């Protein structure tokens, strides 16, 4: 199955957001990222993707289709707006083994605060 995600300047959680910011998927699913507003992309955060997953980075303003294989948690960001809290959490399969590690990792406070809310 496919899950559509919008990249917006302003959404429910404030400025610079991914909607939804919490994506539940299974191996083989696709996640389609649509930059509804310009100035956004999607990029995997180093050490915040499952062991064995492929690192990825889309072009600013491009529709990006990500195929998810490896089970686990993935924290993606918008390159330009990471520091403003523009992130999404992809959970592939049940009980992602690296989720606690990701929650604990060093990241901007705003990011930290948005992550804590998506998880809740
Ligand atoms: Cu952005």
Curated annotation (Swiss-Prot):
Q: What induces it?
A: Under anaerobic growth conditions and by nitrite.
Q: Which domain of life is it from?
A: Bacteria
Principal cellular location given in the protein's record: periplasm
**Where along this sequence does the record place binding of Cu cation?**
40, 78, 81, 86
- What positions does the domain Plastocyanin-like occupy? 5-93
Q: How, per the record, is the cofactor bound? A: Binds 1 copper ion per subunit.
Q: Where in the cell is it found?
A: Periplasm
Keyword Transport applies: yes
Q: For this UniProt record, give its keywords in alphabetical order, as a comma-separated list.
A: Copper, Electron transport, Metal-binding, Periplasm, Signal, Transport
Identify a single GO molecular function assigned to this protein: copper ion binding
**Named cofactor requirement(s):** Cu cation
A GO cellular component entry from the record: periplasmic space
Protein role: This soluble electron transfer copper protein is required for the inactivation of copper-containing nitrite reductase in the presence of oxygen. Serves as a direct electron donor to the nitrite reductase.
This protein is called what? Pseudoazurin
Q: Which organism is it from?
A: Alcaligenes faecalis
């Amino acid at each position: 199955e496919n899950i559509e995600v919008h990249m917006l300047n302003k959404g429910a959680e404030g400025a610079m957001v991914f909607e939804p910011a919490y994506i539940k998927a299974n191996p083989g699913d696709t996640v389609t990222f649509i930059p509804v507003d310009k100035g956004h992309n999607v990029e995997s955060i180093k050490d915040m993707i499952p062991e064995g997953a492929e690192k990825f980075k889309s072009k600013i303003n491009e529709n990006y289709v990500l195929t998810v294989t490896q089970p686990g948690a993935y924290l993606v960001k918008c390159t330009p707006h990471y520091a403003m809290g523009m992130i999404a959490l992809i959970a592939v399969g049940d009980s992602p083994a690296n989720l606690d590690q990701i929650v604990s990792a060093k990241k901007p406070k705003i990011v930290q605060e948005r992550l804590e809310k998506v998880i809740a």
